[PDB]
Design a binder for this molecule. Sequence first.
Ligand SMILES: *[C@@H]1O[C@H](CO)[C@@H](O[C@@H]2O[C@H](CO)[C@@H](O)[C@H](O)[C@H]2NC(C)=O)[C@H](O)[C@H]1NC(C)=O
Ligand SMILES: *[C@@H]1O[C@H](CO)[C@@H](O[C@@H]2O[C@H](CO)[C@@H](O)[C@H](O)[C@H]2NC(C)=O)[C@H](O)[C@H]1NC(C)=O
Ligand SMILES: *[C@@H]1O[C@H](CO)[C@@H](O)[C@H](O)[C@H]1NC(C)=O
Ligand SMILES: *[C@@H]1O[C@H](CO)[C@@H](O)[C@H](O)[C@H]1NC(C)=O
Lengths: 97, 48, 48, 46
Amino acid sequence: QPKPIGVGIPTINLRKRRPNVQNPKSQEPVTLDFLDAELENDIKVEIRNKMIDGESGEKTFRTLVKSQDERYIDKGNRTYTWTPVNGTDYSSLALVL
Amino acid sequence: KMTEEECRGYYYVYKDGDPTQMELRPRQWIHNDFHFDNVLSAMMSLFT
Amino acid sequence: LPLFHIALLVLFMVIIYAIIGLELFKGKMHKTCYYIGTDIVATVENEK
Amino acid sequence: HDDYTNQIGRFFGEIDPSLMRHLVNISVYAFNKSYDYQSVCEPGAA
Ligand SMILES: *[C@@H]1O[C@H](CO)[C@@H](O[C@@H]2O[C@H](CO)[C@@H](O)[C@H](O)[C@H]2NC(C)=O)[C@H](O)[C@H]1NC(C)=O
Ligand SMILES: *[C@@H]1O[C@H](CO)[C@@H](O[C@@H]2O[C@H](CO)[C@@H](O)[C@H](O)[C@H]2NC(C)=O)[C@H](O)[C@H]1NC(C)=O
Ligand SMILES: *[C@@H]1O[C@H](CO)[C@@H](O)[C@H](O)[C@H]1NC(C)=O
Ligand SMILES: *[C@@H]1O[C@H](CO)[C@@H](O)[C@H](O)[C@H]1NC(C)=O
């Protein structure tokens, strides 16, 4: 999703600002880590370190699946596979089922 | 900017001290009002 | 030696106008023109 | 007990924490703690 990410507890004082400038737009990129989109697990590390340059591989395993609203955690079987982009090497894909 | 042609256009005036309060003014040659240009115009400045 | 009475009257000239300026103006300067609620004092570009 | 039915859907730790701090400490139910880097909140104080 958009919106930038990052850094910590955002301290702003209102005792210092001015009735003025728009407080610039932060050309920072939106770089989400694979270990910080999903839940960290010692299998998904072994997926990513295999996926980051690996040629081809699938692994089926019982994981923790965060539910879509952060209320709940469910446990299910994920069979996922991956392959590199045959052309450029600036990506590699994973269909998750 | 140091010379004629390129002291033109708009620039940033940073308030107080910090570079998060940019104001944008234009720029032009300021001629320092008591210049030494003419012998008459230098007796003015050297009178003050 | 002959300047001593002149210099001692200027020393009494200051002490009179220090006590009169002390009792007439104690605390009178401490008001500000800050921005809306901030800590910045509001000036215009040369204004003290 | 009907003081709880004004709460329906609230997390039980804000009702009786001494049960719930205990109940994780004897298994059922466990937890996890992940970070969400994009959640927007309000700025603090200086
Ligand atoms: C790019 O993809 C092609 C197939 O789309 C890969 O071709 C494979 O080549 C290997 C041996 O080199 C064969 O064992 C496979 O059967 C081929 N795949 C297919 C689809 O038949 C090719 O290897 C890929 N590029 C790289 C650099 O690996
Ligand atoms: C997330 O929760 C899982 C729940 O299974 C945790 O995994 C267990 O952790 C305990 C103690 O660390 C171990 O005794 C179990 O053997 C673990 N089970 C498995 C299947 O790994 C996991 O540690 C939690 N992670 C975080 C960061 O809280
Ligand atoms: C994964 O599949 C097996 C075999 O079909 C099934 O018994 C098991 O319940 C599944 N895992 C979970 C967490 O449901
Ligand atoms: C709660 O779990 C911790 C960690 O295993 C353990 O040290 C502690 O004794 C447990 N609490 C009680 C009351 O047994």
